[model samples]
Target chain A: PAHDASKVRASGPGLNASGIPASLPVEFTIDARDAGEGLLTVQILDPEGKPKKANIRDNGDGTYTVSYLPDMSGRYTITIKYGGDEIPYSPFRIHALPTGDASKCLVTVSIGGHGLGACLGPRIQIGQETVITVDAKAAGERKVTCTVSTPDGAELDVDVVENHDGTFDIYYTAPEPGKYVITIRFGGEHIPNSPFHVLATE
Target chain B: PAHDASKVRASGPGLNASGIPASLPVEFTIDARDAGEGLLTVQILDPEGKPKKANIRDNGDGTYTVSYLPDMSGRYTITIKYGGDEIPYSPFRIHALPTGDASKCLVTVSIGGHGLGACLGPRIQIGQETVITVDAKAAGERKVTCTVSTPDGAELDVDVVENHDGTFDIYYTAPEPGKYVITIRFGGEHIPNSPFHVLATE
Candidate 1:
């Protein structure tokens, strides 16, 4: 009798919530008690666009519970389908986080890495490996990522070291003489005054 | 008289562990050495909704070592509190594999920046780019991180390419002739033979 996919009730304790941690398993229930069950299923996808499997438990009365554990912090998509048709709020996305409060994090970044004081105008020599040091010690325990972009779509590679001491150092080189952008993110959010621009010349 | 939650630290490799076994006792330390006097506690919840017990040892140096046994194979939560304040990375979640071997994974060292053939040693030319590779096939699908330590805390551009064939390759140039350390890990555990020392000479 689950003929109408739109008529099925889809709700869970974690369905409408955000900021689910990567280490915890979130669960929600689908109530099809009166609608008659017809292949009620759920599919989960990771932030990397990889399809992931979840645990489904049947209540024996057309009610099913879906459980999934996020491995990493990012946006996760949850899709529910009944009778090969998408259900209400199907393919909804949620953001997962690391085990820390990012709001209290204190992030400081310098263009020329630590000890190099700030480079004049944040400029450096082209083809030379530039070091950028970021201090996120007060930011709680979170994941950090650095994105280096180029002007002409020719991006460069960066090497990072966590130091196991709440600091991260990035090393990268500018291929061509142009403007390069360095974006640093902590716990999936940009730090204050981020996306630092650097000029490289001969 | 014990306070200052900000000073409490909770770090170690076990914080971001994956593919852990139920039979093995998982261990991660809590360093409250410099946080002054405080009531430090560690709580754990197993997959079966039960308060799992932890064996804590005091090192007498204001530091404590916490160890817990995950009796079931599923998601387990760990919470650490200091003077009723949660430390960083508190309430972290870790998933245990049903048949995971924690003490596994073999790493081999070779030259050319790729884990291809057996090189004599980690000796290369200065200011030249070299390649190295790591094979994490038997590690049972976990996170792989490559860390190359430099002498002066400066980083070299680390270019990593996942061959998707159970191996990884990294390319980097030694800025100056000096000794370097390459640390590789598979899911919080160091590989069998890692930390290959490199000597770059003219």
Candidate 2:
């Protein structure tokens, strides 16, 4: 008779204890020996309270896996459905990191859509645009917004409605001058590493 | 004969061999045999990058610190000054975690400030006074702004002035219902692991 190890054996190593990177999505595997006499089923849940289920593939060598994407950040609890009889439950949780890659956006702002060397003209006269570019990805098919505020507190807002092969272009012509703070918004959120500059022509 | 021993002899056990905790802030001590009519001056940079010069005791001992907080979340370089005419430079750097403390501040959206769930009307409410505290620090003294925006789109800007007590608190009120996002701005810079929130009246 195959006996249960729940009462005698203690909890084993956990996924969080394994030092997995929290920033990226990952899959997990659990090797259970003789899990319910050959047939087994596994169900997994992400940190976001989402659930995924899979069958325990019988490799004949007696090892199984419960693979799925952890959708949210923080610890996730996982339970095992082993054996036809519901006697003991093995539950464990793993920590998931917040989604999105947060990399600094290194951009140089300029005036009139041209390099202004840090000093743009007093304000946006017609035919002038501020340009800022960096290394990042824009969520396709998403509306993007650009904002430019002059040193005197004059603010200008625009949307990057079109993306030229994943590149954003937002232009603004300020009616006045001084220093301007330009920010890009895409997908209803501010673009990382933004704040392009534009100067007025003397 | 004396010159050969001075060059080949190791001053302490495992002195020539590489040591662990490479950035150890060790106190300096001198032996009469090693001093031999010479003086050693030492200085160090603490994790805060502040200079801490070691005062040589009347007994000819020097305190040395080899650790320094990185300017950002990357490798840092620390330099040590010692010996007259022969400055033995031991460079090391400390790491700065923008993610803040791992063991502290969980990813829980509590209604009370300071990440504590003890305050708030029934733990969470709509348009009521609530404080959302984030676990992060400014590398230096600067104005930190925390903004609260309802899931429905109303935004409220709150300023959290850092105090000498090593903690900051910002007032938050979800004027609308639904999910609220709290963002903290540190000197126009936003670090990760922020933006915790609470639910409005259901």
Candidate 3:
């Protein structure tokens, strides 16, 4: 008779995300097979500290697909319990936003490869390229774009590459050494940290 | 007996990271007490396809701590097997970089709070603030710093706050509606992809 709460494992995109699109179905997986027979409970709290119900579909194989819909924009707390005890990383904190909220997008900028080796902090020597990565996988469908401007207010020539994998990347090289601006937009709105400043050294 | 591999849940910063500083012991957690009487095998493959030994410590509980040290910088693959089958998210791919490498630092920039509400990307109205967070928790012991500069190559008054929890935060405000530069340093070295460009709106 093994009913260990520590053995209950839950995973999936829904469980680990810090932000999710509101008014859409959010889902994750839970496995309690090895924990023996026990009741699993899921509770959701909105930004206003109100309780919301969720749908738990028992796969009949000691596994479950937990689904819920968040219809408002703000912080959401999810509490997952197995056998009256909290599981690991329980009370997962995530934000729910409208479909087009820019903060919901995950954007990263890096410089590496092509004989540049690897340096930290959005930096590159003159004529070297810096890469921009954006992941809107769970930010809902959005039209994303990127633009770069130089020190003299001239628009830098750079194009965004669509990976067809719910993400996008961009490559830009600084022609002159100075501070430059990079703007990334999601659904016509600047992403959380849009218009990032980059330094191209001499 | 629950002799299943699919139910084993393993996760941690070590398991999810795509890059880590080499020479430092990389560690992650595993739970298989309820996984029946079976074998737990941990494997590490360096860039050259050579097998490297990993240290596994049974935590005396139902969990374990798997650790390994990569003396070289390159891509390393980690495999977690239980009952002769792969666990979830097994065969994790991670690149090990040398000490003082910038990529080992997790840097994030965001703009929000006050009347600015919460728009996406790093953007705020003129005179508003932007926040930068850098986590060097597992990048070995390193001194982290951040600085902000405004248009025209003038430095802004921004100070880094050490959280004492292996993380650092910085608050920067743009006085003019233009692009700004944020530089974060780890161990006195520019962290990867730094000197980020940020646009400030009017």
Candidate 4:
């Protein structure tokens, strides 16, 4: 067990310095091997088992990071799907956790919606004034279509981003609206799944 | 030989209805064989290839019926997934007769803060209400859960009228705020993951 001294540890609830409270930002990370043989899809599920957003950023080694904000005040589940599969349903609901009530909404980000994983993930409560950031990686000149859509047809899209290793980040500005979904697409390739929302203004 | 049954007749989009208008109540009678098996999952995708609801209904039979409330003035897609297998990737789209720009927008349905669907399956225009009924023949006491999540978790334990012949209709309301993910259980067995939500609203 100590030959190379290289061991992998499972990443637990990654809560920032702030206590486990509602409306605070929580970072979820999954320890996976990044051999580039397969694509790892990370999803945030609410207590009710719905998928939310966060992009998978490869650390070039075996570590990948997808920054997601938790604003909701309920239990959340995290699921990871590894492979070139277009849809995100395999070895699902790998992890889950609970948070506070509406008083604990966190930051939020938006993007155009797609991905079968989001609907089949976990659940979390939503908060207000929370800003979300959606980061993704792509290659060459790409069309990154980002959108923030609500249940009532209120949708906004932000296009055009610099290609940094095919990575892009778009901010969704909706902290006080109903539940919304973030969807994104790059040059005809639909990003996995992301389920998110901007809660009503408290 | 007078009528070549092998020749596909002009069934008017395979039904008596043609050129379905936007934001209007449209209905179709699905057959038991069309829904496949005892369980069926119906999805309405918009022209953009996105799920339009948490509006997926479970038809106990192979037969089903659905209504469309257009959220946008564009072509829509309707998809059905048989529960025995993984939901397929390929989707179908139907061009809806434009009722004007006012009916154009991404429609999502949510109850209990869950994003049901957003233009994922079939496209419906704004203010248009679509009703999809699945012919589920699974009988016994079909438990319907409510949105009151807390205490012991999501307030579940309501039953639908499931005939002994394995047929039932899980009635849903017009989605009041703060409700999402309607979980159903059959004889205490959570329908092997039968949770639904309202992804958008008109």
Residue B69 miss distance in model 2 (angstroms): 64
Which TM-score value belongs to model 3?
0.28
Question: Would you list the C-alpha lDDT of every candidate in the order shown?
Answer: 0.62, 0.41, 0.68, 0.39
lDDT (10s digit) by residue, model 4, range B95-196 = 555422221212233322434343121111223333222223433222212221222223432334443453343434433334345444332223333444
Stretches off by above 4 angstroms in model 2 are: A1-14, A23-27, A34-38, A53-56, A84-89, A98-202, B1-202
- Model 3, range B127-192, lDDT digits (tens) per residue? 656666777887667556555667766544356787989887778766887767776666545676
lDDT (10s digit) by residue, model 2, range B63-108:
2222221222323333433334223334434332333332232121
Per DockQ, the best of the predicted structures is 4
List TM-scores for all candidates, in order: 0.30, 0.24, 0.28, 0.23
DockQ class, candidate 2: incorrect
For model 2 the local lDDT of residue B80 reads: 32
The residue-level lDDT of candidate 3 at A14 comes to: 66
Model 4 gets an lDDT of 0.39
Candidate 3 is graded, for docking, as incorrect
State the displacement of the C-alpha of residue A150, model 2, in Å, after optimal TM-score superposition. 42
Instruction: Kindly indicate the candidate among 3 and 4 with the higher lDDT.
Output: 3
Question: Residue-wise lDDT of candidate 4 within A1-202, one digit each (tens)?
Answer: 1111122223434423233333233455545442235566665664445455655677877666665544334455555555533222323233222321211111122223322212321222334222233233322243344555665655444443433554444544444535666655443233445333334433
Q: Of the candidates numbered 1 and 2, which has the greater lDDT value? A: 1
